[PDB]
Nucleic acid binder design. Sequence first.
RNA 1: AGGGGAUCGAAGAUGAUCAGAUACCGUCGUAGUCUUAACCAUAAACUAUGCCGACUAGGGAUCGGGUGGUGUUUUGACCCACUCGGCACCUUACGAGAAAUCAAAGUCUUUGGGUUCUGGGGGGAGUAUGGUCGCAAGGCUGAAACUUAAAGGAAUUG
Lengths: 87, 121, 216, 97, 25, 129, 48, 206
Amino acid sequence: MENDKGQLVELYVPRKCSATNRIIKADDHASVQINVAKVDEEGRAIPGEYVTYALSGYVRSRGESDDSLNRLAQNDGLLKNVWSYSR
Amino acid sequence: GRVRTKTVKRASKALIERYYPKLTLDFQTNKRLCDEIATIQSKRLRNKIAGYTTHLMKRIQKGPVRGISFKLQEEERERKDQYVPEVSALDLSRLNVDNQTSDLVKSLGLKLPLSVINVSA
Amino acid sequence: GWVPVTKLGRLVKAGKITTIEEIFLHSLPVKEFQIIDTLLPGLQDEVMNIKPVQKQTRAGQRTRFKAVVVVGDSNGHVGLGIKTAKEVAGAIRAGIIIAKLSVIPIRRGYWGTNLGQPHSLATKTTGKCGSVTVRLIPAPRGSGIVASPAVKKLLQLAGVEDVYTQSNGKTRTLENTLKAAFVAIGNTYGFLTPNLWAEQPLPVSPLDIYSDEASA
Amino acid sequence: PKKRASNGRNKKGRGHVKPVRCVNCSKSIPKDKAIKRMAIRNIVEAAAVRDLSEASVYPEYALPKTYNKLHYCVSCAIHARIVRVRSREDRKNRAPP
Amino acid sequence: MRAKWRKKRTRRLKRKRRKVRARSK
Amino acid sequence: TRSSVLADALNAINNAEKTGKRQVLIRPSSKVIIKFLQVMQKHGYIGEFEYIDDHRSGKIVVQLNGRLNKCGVISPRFNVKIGDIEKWTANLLPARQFGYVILTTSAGIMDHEEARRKHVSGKILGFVY
Amino acid sequence: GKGKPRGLNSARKLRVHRRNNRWAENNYKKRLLGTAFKSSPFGGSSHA
Amino acid sequence: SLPATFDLTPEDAQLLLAANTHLGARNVQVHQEPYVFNARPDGVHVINVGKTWEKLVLAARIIAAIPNPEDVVAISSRTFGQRAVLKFAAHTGATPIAGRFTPGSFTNYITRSFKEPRLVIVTDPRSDAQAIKEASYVNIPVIALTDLDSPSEFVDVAIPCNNRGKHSIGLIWYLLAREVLRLRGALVDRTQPWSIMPDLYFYRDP
RNA sequence: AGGGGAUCGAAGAUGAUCAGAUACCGUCGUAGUCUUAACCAUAAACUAUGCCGACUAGGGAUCGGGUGGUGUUUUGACCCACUCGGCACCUUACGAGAAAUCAAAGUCUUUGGGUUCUGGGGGGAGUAUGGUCGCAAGGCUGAAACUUAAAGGAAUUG
């Protein structure tokens, strides 16, 4: 949100859940942010680097968090044969 | 009634976790240690504190008691937490698997020493 | 003096967290009232109402007091706090602390053209506590805060300049009207508008990038 | 307010349930609401078993049993300690003692 | 008084107003 | 019995998005449903969708994203003069910078801001925002 | 829906229904019956 | 994508089926259906060991992400899992919570048992519900060893496995420790086996 | 109005308790209880919850029908999986509610699927009067003067 001459007049831009694309508000205290470690050629984690995800409180409370991470992980290559689209 | 209060139960508890080697199974000796080991404000309280401690040494003789840990018992505890058999219970003594279990091995594509046996409800 | 007892409290004193926007952005829990006031030193407080309350015992009525407090910046941050205590002074003192721990932001946009600075809410929002329902609609410039005396104070201490309000239900219970207004105004950041549709990368949590400093 | 979700009886999908009479006070209570117990006891009580065996003109005579099913209305079920007032959370329990 | 017995009383009252008025009619 | 198929279609879409699902199946299809879903699509609200043929008025499958807040119908389809749109939008739109009200005119099914350009008006159908 | 018709051609039921339900109001009942001119000692005047 | 050396090796498969990690509960809940392979007669559902291992490495990778090792907390309230946790916290740096979970560990900031971790692992969500529920107030990720019928509310990575077997519970804890150590460089070669036998993680009945 | 009339039993009669007991308790006992022909049209007639339609969370048990299993005992009975239509039940809160609670009482200030019925502080009053139905008891429709600051719902501590 900008003003008549291009200046951003918004306090801050909130994140959004990966599984649902909904805003993660300030006091959504069930929400999480996972970090998945990348691996060098020798099969060892690379310090300080991740493939990051966020999941909203709603998803986690319904029990869909496990399935939604399987979808996202497999897409990004972090898993091979965990998720099948046809149920 | 002969129910001790918490100021006695806890004072005796503190003595055992810090002075197990020196306590004995005898009231009179334990009476004199509590004078050299703790500062107590009366003859009456001092007798009661020592009396319970004797009672607790008797318990520890027959077996360990919940709520009291001391240098000797914890050392013998950790020693048996390093136990491990000669051969794993997972190691092969001869592996059997159901028919459906066998199908799973095939799908994954692993070669294993499978024996199949029948199964029913 | 102050000695932290939580990871966020340590980083804030050490200066690694400088603005309150990082806390809201990552939704970190706040459990030390010193964190809020080291980042928003401009807060001003207000006690809305004080009422007595009694329970029954064999030897008569046990009387204790209830105080409501609102703290805010008049620049986009507010909080609401209620405490019950044996003395009136204590209820107020503890109410300021509970209110501060619950500071939330607000989203201010325009009613018409995007000329000048924001002056009103970005969208209609509703809030409900008990039976009271407070609804805020955008209003043009020069309208002012069209609301009852109790709710007007909360909106002034939030930074909204022009706003309409409609209420339904038993408004006379002031704790529920102020709670309903507080929920309604915080929902302004939950509502997704088309100007946020863009995808932004997730920032790395401050508690991870300054990991060593948080430990001690 | 509503105290029980079953209305204190066991009627669902039914218009009417014919009534029975309590065994202590002789009052009509619908079958599905009545408190019902089964009292099976040896005909010869325990303290008399030895004398009857010694007196039997047979060896190995099995003691006959007496069977009956008893219906109580709520008022007489409370009094006879067959059922007792029970707490909020503990009312929902269905499992016998 | 109990709602049931108040209904009964009113009914017995009407029955009598119904026969005192029948003298004139 | 079934009175408005559009009311069913938007109800299904709203309920699914509200609970997180990323797709829906709306049955039966209709021309007015396709035309409504193209306006929703043209502004990014829904995404792709497909029409399953079954010789019996067909089914549809809609791919959603998190954008949609509420989609609904206004029944009965009230007559709207040209100058009364400014009092319909002010009633059922979060603000006057986004959101649409879709109304059927002789020029076709259109959102109100395309009806202002073309200078047309007619019956009202629903809204999306 | 709710307990009223919504159809475009349902206006008559909404007029007549409401007309019937205005008689629960105390103000409406007194004014139309005109009980001021019948039972009020002042007959509807400000002073007597 | 992971190097091909991470696939399920035959040596590991012998361990997994030996410990009966592939024998599931007689009931399955909808969210766990993808982890089921086929239904034997008698109703026992065989868990797909392939997805068990693949999920196991991903859980290991999230564990290796947290910088300070003391911020990973391992809970196990039941007897079969307490020894496994104490040794998982030994070889790695995780802080264990064995025995009973004190309400207010993650929420009350003046209790002597206050832990504010970055990841928690639990052996059985049904019995460790207090830890998982409290994990939802303070934004704490959760990993859990999950049987086909266990609840999945507030659980992010579920490592499907038999959780009613003594050998099964221990082996899964043993395997994670191995993978986190390897990722961090503690162990040199992924090819060779580890020199600590899995029986160190099992529960002694006397 | 005929028939039947064993049991229980408004009325009635009695014995006892009691300050009184034209009540509860004990014993008698007519109308009634049951059937045929014809009236009445009522109830806490209750799920205190209108009907048709779509959509939204998890788990097991049961009634009817159908499909697959040559399952097992000697396709009848069972057993396992699936499906349609019912009577319900357990767990939970995305949601609703003033709460008690509720898978509908949700998809309602982000207010519109179709439709019918009813209510507007508490009393006077479901009363008076006028109609209409009934053999009668009575049913349906149903006011006004006057009076009043509270009646009332769900939970909390005593």
